[PDB]
Every structure is written in C-alpha cells, then in structure tokens.
C-alpha cells in the first residue's frame, strides 16, 4: 500500500475452503460460517458449524423452542 508493492499473501481457509488475505483470514476465521461452534445449550452434539446452529437450535437441540 501507500503507492508501494508489499505483497499480501492469501491463506486458504480450511472451513469455507476459500482463498482469503492473510490479513483478513485472521479476523475472517471468526466470521466464517462453516467454522464449528459449541452449542450454548450444551445439549451434547458438541460442535456444529455456525450456519448449522440456527437450524439445530430449532429441534435438534434438546431444549424446546417454538
Ligand atoms: Zn473461512
Ligand atoms: Zn444444542
């Protein structure tokens, strides 16, 4: 940057299997949906993709929700 050629390497996320900037990947890792996340209800499933928690919390999870 700043009218210069530094070179920002990219790190292939193992979750979204996509290519990102090593500078972003650091933070993205959090945004990445695929990334597994522990259930807040500690039902048992253990870990489940961030984009999988929503549906799971629907019925999958032990708790009840309508
Ligand atoms: Zn990712
Ligand atoms: Zn659960």
Contacts of 34 (CB under 8 A, 6+ apart): 13, 15, 16, 17, 49, 50, 51
**Ligand number, closest to the Cα atom of 13:** 1
- Alpha carbons 40 and 53: distance in angstroms, whole number: 9
Please name each of the domains of the chain with its CATH number: 1-66 (3.30.40.10)
Residue length of the chain: 66
Cα-to-centroid distance, 63 and ligand 1 (Å): 29
Cα-to-centroid distance, 49 and ligand 2 (Å): 12
Reduce the secondary structure of 1-17 to three states and give it as a string: CCCCCCCCCEEECCCCC
Distance, CA of 57 to chain centre: 17
Method for structure elucidation: NMR
Residue in 62, 39, 29 with CA at minimum distance from that of residue 20: 29
CB 43 within 8 A of CB 63: yes
- Alpha carbons 15 and 25: distance in angstroms, whole number: 11
Cα-to-centroid distance, 45 and ligand 1 (Å): 22
CB 37 within 8 A of CB 53: yes
Contacts of 53 (CB under 8 A, 6+ apart): 37, 39
């Amino acid at each position: 940057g700043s009218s210069g050629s530094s070179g920002k390497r990219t790190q292939p996320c193992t979750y979204c299997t996509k290519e990102f900037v090593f500078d972003t990947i650091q933070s993205h890792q959090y945004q990445c949906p695929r990334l597994p996340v522990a259930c807040p209800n500690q039902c048992g499933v253990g870990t489940v993709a961030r984009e999988d928690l929503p549906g799971h919390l629907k019925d999958s999870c032990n708790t009840a929700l309508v």
